């Protein structure tokens, strides 16, 4: 009953905080590690209990260089972007998919919109306005998930604790095959 | 944008009515065929419309049924809540067959006729053979022994859970 998850995506898109809120239940306000230490989550699906190992990744000198070594013996990949950063969504299609297809190909991919709480925030809307950009819409997000062939598209906010459980329960359902 | 689903399970467990209610929108009371005509449903997932081909099966049917398995993406193994025997056959008959012919595919275990779980006449009939309607726990346990992708319960008669069954199968079929 054991499975492995790897989470990847642009720096600062919210990967580590998402794992921490799911695992520990509280958003980390001051200290955030670069990568969440490996942890085994208990996830209940259809009455069954599976242990899900959470493998966080980064792009910081050596963490970037070592990241391909996380994919072996994986069962599900989370590709993340931040709703307040359309640039991080462009890299989902540009950089991250190319990596997963190079290293994994046959694993299910969940596409995860992180920081969903920033979607309607005026300060972000004004900043993105300057380049004629907007926070990512569910439409655009679901559209990129299809383009990259993902298993599911999900949105979440670590900060408000919205949608976090659904990400990991879904990812676990995909991992069980 | 196309996927194929095959539905299997004991005769009269509710396979054909489930497809008709999902496809056509009305529970079939006048005419019910042994197997529904092959039909392609539109199912929306994550904003995407996918065409889901529905392949009904029966038991000159116990022998021709394997010709439905090629090119499937998802299998529904069905039983009826008012028939624990049909749940017993999931493992004794149906799981070995789908793995013999398909092996690669996600499997959903689907409790059908869920509207009968609390029907008094049903409960008394099963009492006479020391049985009771299948519980959620009893179904989930078989879904576990079967390594199934999902366990779902539904009632075609009343429509509870029907949409969710086919939306889940489509999500599974995209693997
Ligand atoms: N508004 C908002 N900010 C977030 C959320 N999750 C993370 N952040 C912030 O994004 C920054 C980077 O987050 P982090 O988890 O370290 O991103 P990572 O590099 O992918 O691990 C930090 O300042 C977090 O406080 C969220 O759900 N909402
Ligand atoms: N109570 C109840 N009866 C049902 C339901 N679905 C089918 N039936 C009945 O089960 C019998 C056989 O149904 P059918 O769809 O032909 O089962 P199949 O042999 O698996 O194709 C018929 O009398 C149906 O009306 C349901 O959801 N609830
Ligand atoms: Mg990080
Ligand atoms: Mg029939």
Author numbering:
A (entry chain B): 4 to 180
B (entry chain A): 4 to 62, 65 to 180
What did the article's authors report about this structure?
Here, we report on the crystal structure of Rho1 from Schizosaccharomyces pombe (SpRho1) in complex with GDP in the presence of Mg2+ at a 2.78 Å resolution. The gel filtration showed that the protein existed as a monomer, but the asymmetric unit comprised a dimeric SpRho1–GDP complex, which suggested the possibility of a monomer–dimer equilibrium in the solution. Each monomer of the dimer consisted of seven α-helices and a mixed twisted β-sheet consisting of six β-strands, of which five were parallel and one (the second) was antiparallel. The SpRho1 dimeric interface incorporated α7, the turn region between β2 and β3, with a total buried area of 1495 Å2. The dimer was stabilized by several hydrogen-bonding contacts and hydrophobic interactions, with residues of Asp50, Arg52, Tyr155, and Arg177 from both monomers involved in hydrogen bonding. The bound GDP molecule was well defined in the electron density map and located within a positively charged pocket formed by residues Ala16, Gly18, Lys19, Thr20, Cys21, Lys119, and Asp121, along with a Mg2+ ion. The Mg2+ ion coordinated with residues Thr20 and Thr38, the GDP β-phosphorous oxygen and water molecules. The structure of the GDP-bound form of SpRho1 was similar to that of HsRhoA–GDP–Mg2+ (Hs: Homo sapiens), which also showed a Mg2+ coordination with two threonine, GDP, and water molecules. We found that SpRho1 resembled all three of the complexes examined, with good superimposition and RMSD values of less than 1 Å. However, discrepancies were observed in five different regions (RMSD plot), with subtle differences identified in the Switch I (Gly29–Ala45) and Switch II (Asp60–Val80) regions, the Rho insert domain, and at the loop region from Phe107 to Pro112.
The Rho protein, a homolog of Ras, is a member of the Ras superfamily of small GTPases. Rho family proteins are involved in cytoskeletal organization, cell mobility, and polarity, and are implicated in cancer morphogenesis. Like other Ras-like GTPases, Rho GTPases can switch between inactive GDP-bound and active GTP-bound forms through the actions of guanine nucleotide exchange factors (GEFs), GTPase-activating proteins (GAPs), and guanine nucleotide dissociation inhibitors (GDIs). The Rho family was delineated from the rest because of its unique insert region between the conserved G4 and G5 boxes, which is absent among other GTPase families.
